[PDB]
Amino acid sequence: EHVAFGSEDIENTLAKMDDGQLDGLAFGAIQLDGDGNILQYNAAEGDITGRDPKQVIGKNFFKDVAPCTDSPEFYGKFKEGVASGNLNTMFEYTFDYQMTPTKVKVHMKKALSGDSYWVFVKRV
Numbered sequence: 001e002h003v004a005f006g007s008e009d010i011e012n013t014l015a016k017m018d019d020g021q022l023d024g025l026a027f028g029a030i031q032l033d034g035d036g037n038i039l040q041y042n043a044a045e046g047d048i049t050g051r052d053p054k055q056v057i058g059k060n061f062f063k064d065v066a067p068c069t070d071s072p073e074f075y076g077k078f079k080e081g082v083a084s085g086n087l088n089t090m091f092e093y094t095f096d097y098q099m100t101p102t103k104v105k106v107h108m109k110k111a112l113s114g115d116s117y118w119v120f121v122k123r124v
């Protein structure tokens with residue numbers, strides 16, 4: 001699926017995509033609701049983290065799946081963007097819970113559908 005991490009219109013392209021199409025992205029893609037529950041989780045993300053995409057759907061990202069992200073630097077910025085209504089922000093991070101420690105770049109961006117927010121991930 002031809003779309004680059006950090007693209008200016010990434011939210012438009014992914015709004016058109018089904019599960020198999022999301023699985024064809026070169027980067028990890030997670031869709032969360034405003035509470036952090038997992039709506040979508042693609043195959044590239046599971047390749048990074050060792051999570052089975054079907055198993056994590058419905059779980060809470062910040063409480064259950066990814067406690068290392070429950071911090072001002074990650075969850076705090078997610079919450080701020082959900083509240084302000086315009087989430088679009090990038091940072092580096094280390095993922096290390098139930099996986100080998102892995103440096104990543106994260107891009108958070110509001111989705112087009114209601115109460116929906118993307119978390120995109122690639123290795124660094």
Ligand SMILES: *C(=O)/C=C/c1ccc(O)cc1
Nearest residue numbers: 049066067068069095097
């Ligand atoms: C830290 O606990 C991060 C964990 C994690 C990040 C991203 C995922 O897709 C799964 C687990």
